[PDB]
Amino acid sequence: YYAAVMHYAVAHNPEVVVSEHQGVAAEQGSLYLVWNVRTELRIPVGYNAIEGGSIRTPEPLEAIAYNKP
Amino acid sequence: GFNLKVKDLNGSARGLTQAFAIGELKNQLSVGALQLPLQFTRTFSASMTSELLWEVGKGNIDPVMYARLFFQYAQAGGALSVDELVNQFTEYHQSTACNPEIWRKLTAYITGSSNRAIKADAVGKVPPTAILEQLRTLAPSEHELFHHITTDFVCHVLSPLGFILPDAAYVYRVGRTATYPNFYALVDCVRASDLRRMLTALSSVDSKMLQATFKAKGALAPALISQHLANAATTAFERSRGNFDANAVVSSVLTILGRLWSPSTPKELDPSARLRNTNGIDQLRSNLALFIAYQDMVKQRGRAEVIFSDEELSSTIIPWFIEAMSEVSPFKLRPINETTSYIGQTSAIDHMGQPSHVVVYEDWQFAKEITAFTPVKLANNSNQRFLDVEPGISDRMSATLAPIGNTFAVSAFVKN
Amino acid sequence: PSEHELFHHITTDFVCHVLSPLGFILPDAAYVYRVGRTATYPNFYALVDCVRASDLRRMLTALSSVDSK
Amino acid sequence: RTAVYEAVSQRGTVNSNGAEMTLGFPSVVERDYALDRDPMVAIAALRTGIVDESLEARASNDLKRSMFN
Amino acid sequence: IQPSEVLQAKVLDLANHTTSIHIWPWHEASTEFAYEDAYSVTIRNKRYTAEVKEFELLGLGQRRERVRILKPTVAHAIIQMWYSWFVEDDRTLAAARRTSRDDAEKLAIDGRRMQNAVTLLRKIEMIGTTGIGASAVH
Amino acid sequence: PRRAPAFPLSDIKAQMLFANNIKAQQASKRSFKEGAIETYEGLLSVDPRFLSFKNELSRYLTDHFPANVDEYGRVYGNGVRTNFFGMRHMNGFPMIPATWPLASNLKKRADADLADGPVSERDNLLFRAAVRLMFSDLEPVPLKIRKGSSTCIPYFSNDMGTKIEIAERALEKAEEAGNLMLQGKFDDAYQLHQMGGAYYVVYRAQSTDAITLDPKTGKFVSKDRMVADFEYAVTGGEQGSLFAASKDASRLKEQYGIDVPDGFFCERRRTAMGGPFALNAPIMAVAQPVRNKIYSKYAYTFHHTTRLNKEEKVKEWSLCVATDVSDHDTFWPGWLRDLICDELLNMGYAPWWVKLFETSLKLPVYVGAPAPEQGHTLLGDPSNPDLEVGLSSGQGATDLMGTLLMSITYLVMQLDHTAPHLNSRIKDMPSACRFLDSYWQGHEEIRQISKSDDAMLGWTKGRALVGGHRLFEMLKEGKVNPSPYMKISYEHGGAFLGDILLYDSRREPGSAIFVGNINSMLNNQFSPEYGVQSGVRDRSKRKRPFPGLAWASMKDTYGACPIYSDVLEAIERCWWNAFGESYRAYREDMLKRDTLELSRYVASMARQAGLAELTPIDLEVLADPNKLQYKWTEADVSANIHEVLMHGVSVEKTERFLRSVMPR
Ligand SMILES: [Mn+2]
């Protein structure tokens, strides 16, 4: 199910990285992926307001959320 | 299908938020900012559809296909995973190939009577099959499969000698596999990768030698057929092992990959000389599609110590010995978007313009034809049931489905 | 005379090539010439030169070859 | 010359560009200087753009022979 | 961006082959041996100009008639660019002191000016008195 | 020390071998052979204009074509690994004086510290296993023998029928005679069956030498050839000395007065030895079938034909390791003989025959005239022989020995330093059985190709390879050799039978590939060894039949070398620079004359039908029959000239004979 979105989160966009996100516990490694894509200048969508040019972005679905049909 | 809020998806489909793929919850929704970029490219291909029959058939035995079958049934079967199944197979292989007294009895069921192998004369009174029943009398498998394959082995070495007489055929269906997922499945794939050579060494080498010892024309052979067969078969079992641990080898190569992926410090783990780009692992640098394996790797487990690390190794051999290159499985392999090339997409929506309705989906089948059958069985044993379609209904019911494909044009249906 | 002998050598080379099977390989010496740097390289007229020369590849070789064993 | 840049303060900037800054090509000089044509005359010929019609088959066009590159 | 850029040519071996066989860009490569660079030294109210006949700078004797240097390229473009760019330099700086404007800058540039020349000064000795122009001063 | 007894040449034993005839007594009395080979008929080795042809050849070309083997000794680039200057010798005149072969390198084996037996007793078992299998299943087939092959020691008869009587009587009472030797009646069988006897020193001649140009002054230094004297010999490496023979040609500008062009020393005088056949009959009669065996039961490490034959096996490999072997013959252990005879008997092999081996395997020798005013020294005492002279050439099964211990120490070392944990599947002698079978079946990660000393190695995905890299590294350093039986280095500039494996930038077994050496071709042209003795009606006696063949076969041959045609350029060019003519048409006509000469020699290839019957390999065997005596195995030849070269021997006599020799 997770394997789903990521793949077509590849196309749109090859934007990547992200960091290991150790938080406070615990650094055994923890690094997913990020997607800057490119956007329209309005964001009533996504808690990550980061409209600036484009969302960066923490989660794959938002790319699609900002994606064209 | 279901629905969820976008801003609140972590409060909604919280597991689905990928941050969940990591143990992250926190005050914080993962993320932040950092470093090293490379689109992770070239994903393993499309195992969906492509259903078809395959033939076990000949005793000439292709380990490769059989492996594919093992993963196949394994996911499809009554016993996960492939791993334990391979263990059980090795057990059976001991109980059979490494258990010589059986073979005496087998030759006994073949030409066996007295003063074997009844000099130079032929006489191969056997269906392949009858052997199979005799072995069925022996140790049962929950999952015979290989129980056929062992017979196939009996054929392969008895093929040079006049016992090609039985030759019938054996058939089995596929089974659809997903995206495809979990690294444990990869573990299955790597132990199966061993099976490729855990098995073939007995599937091969074998003997062209002895016809049947020749000794013109060849040959007398008491237990000597069973002798030469099994003792070599056991010997073949010895060279087989695969040595290298299943979960370990993937754990390590995944370790080197993920820490290669690391923007935060690689530290002692690092890109290096022959530590990396060994004319293949760099191709994995290009195969970074198997990302997520690192994700659950820390999640399913935790620290990914390379433990059999070494530094020459590996490098050296182990990444070389990675599964996809040994190509079992619906492990599949491909460039980028073709796996995505079955993704629907409809922004729909308006004025805002972005949000209230943006759907996705997939294009799909309706080859209407569907079939049914009697389960004829020439002899009781398991489920080797012959079946013939029942066209008289089978066609018309399919015909009944014919408009229905024009109905529910799912793409058009999305428009709804 | 040629203003630009060059081929004037080459015609001799042709004399050699067919006289090579016969006992007149005796003269065999050697001939040498430098390059010359060329630019980006430019104008389509130069390409015109290149295509007529492209003909020369076969304008010439047919006499440079076939020949006689 | 890069070092010259800080000379001279202070910031303009709209009133007068901008500057060429950029070209100083070794290549364009050598291409013409190889024939000892002296490229430097060709330079101004690209300043005004138009060729000054020094009508000679090894004069005028050779200038243009450079301009293309 | 700052160039990657590595290209740099090389003279052809020539002699190793023309020890056997003729080349034909010749003529082109020319004659070719300048120069009589006389120079004066105006020690107080007197001239004392001196000059020298190229070949013995090399210490060879005597005059050679028919030695044939090529006409090496590349470098011409560099040194020319160097020359002309100095022209851009001193023109700009001199104009700057002519008005800009505002003292803090003028000394800067006129200060700047100095070491620019000073810089060239230094490198010019490397051009000469270190092989083989020491023969020239000699 | 203990001198191997230095009986005078004159001795009745010296007589009993020889037919006491022309060649017999002459060979007893033989002077030092010397003489420019007619390097081409109508063309000795000595022609000065051709010498200048060498001059231009090696100089101008090595100039143009420096070697391309990398640090690892693995190869790239042009693929050259060799000075072309190895041409530059008196290739018709040997570099003189000569070595005196020992009687025991056992201390020399204790200097290289080569082991007196097993490392691990496990290793012992391994030895016992290779022995177990080399002494295993057998499918006897008729023996065969070279036509025109002199009986050498003993009689030196050229007649085949002599060899017939000898071998057949041997078939009749090898039991009785090997018993006599067990009974110690050496000379009785030696003078009735005339079995066994002695070796006679002869020469291999290294056509080349490691001539090295000096950038600072042009010196051309061939590798020095350190050699034993008679005392270093009899005192098994104890007394005596190790020393270069004179390389000089001015000593013939001296003696012969012959002019001495630069860099042209004299070919190395390697020394083979001939010996009695009656025991070599059982040797071929089994081993040749054993040859067929491993080539059938295994091949793999063993089959030897096309570079393709090998390469296909190779590019497979993730890792590959060409081998490099120290003095291949002398080093063979006698305790190895001990285990041999051991398990021979253990597995029912005939004790008299076993005695026959040990007789030959320590058989007394003889030195002719190693220098003028040298030799004619009978050696050993065919009454109590005890020689540990190493692998004498008279045996043809020596190759089995080389391939043996080499493969041993190889695989073993692979255990030692790459797969020790894997030795766990080597639980015992039977485990060694399934295994060794499988390894020569190749179903293993650690791997090899093998042929006597020459060999290579292979590796893959699977839990063993990184240690292969390690052992690789150590051996590449060569700083210390783990092998206690051999000084096995890597060969920088490694190759297998002239199959120079090439590597690309990736430097992989799957990278670049074997090539037939072209410099080796040059050798074939110009730096081989023998003359023909044209003064005989039949070329069957002649050392070197039809060189023109190789000419035509060249692309088909060493055109495997990529740069091939350029070599053609160079050769034809330099010849026009030499005799100023067409070495092309020259050699073509030589080929034509080869066809002419062979034409009457051949029947079924009706008249001058053309050469279509002969394989390009067999073509290589027809320009070069000679290596068939130390490269090609007999079966390789197409049956036509095979029989022109060889003659059959009865399957039956040999059959029952083996039935005796074999544990049944
Ligand atoms: Mn080789």
Residue numbers in the entry:
A (entry chain B): 486 to 554
B (entry chain B): 1 to 416
C (entry chain A): 140 to 208
D (entry chain A): 417 to 485
E (entry chain A): 555 to 692
F (entry chain C): 1 to 664
Please give me the paper's original passages concerning this structure.
Here, we present a general computational method termed ‘localized reconstruction' for solving structures of symmetry-mismatched parts of macromolecular complexes. The method allows symmetry-mismatched and/or flexible subunits to be treated as isolated single particles separate from the rest of the complex, facilitating their classification, refinement and reconstruction. To demonstrate how localized reconstruction can be used to address symmetry-mismatched components, we focused on the RNA-dependent RNA polymerase of bacteriophage φ6.
Finally, we present the structure of the φ6 RNA-dependent RNA polymerase at 7.9-Å resolution, demonstrating that the structure can be determined for a symmetry-mismatched, globular 75-kDa enzyme inside a 15-MDa icosahedral viral particle. Localized reconstruction provided the in situ structure of the P2 polymerase to sub-nanometer resolution. The reconstruction was of sufficient quality to allow unambiguous fitting of the known atomic structure of P2 and to reveal possible P1–P2 interactions. Others have previously located the RNA-dependent RNA polymerase under the fivefold symmetry positions in the rotavirus and under the threefold symmetry positions in bacteriophage φ6 polymerase complex using conventional icosahedral reconstruction. Such an approach applies incorrect symmetry to the symmetry-mismatched structures, such as the polymerase in these studies. The application of the localized reconstruction method to the polymerase complexes of φ6 exemplifies how this limitation can be circumvented, allowing the structure of a viral polymerase to be determined in situ. This opens up new possibilities for studying RNA replication and transcription in the context of the assembled double-stranded RNA virus capsids.
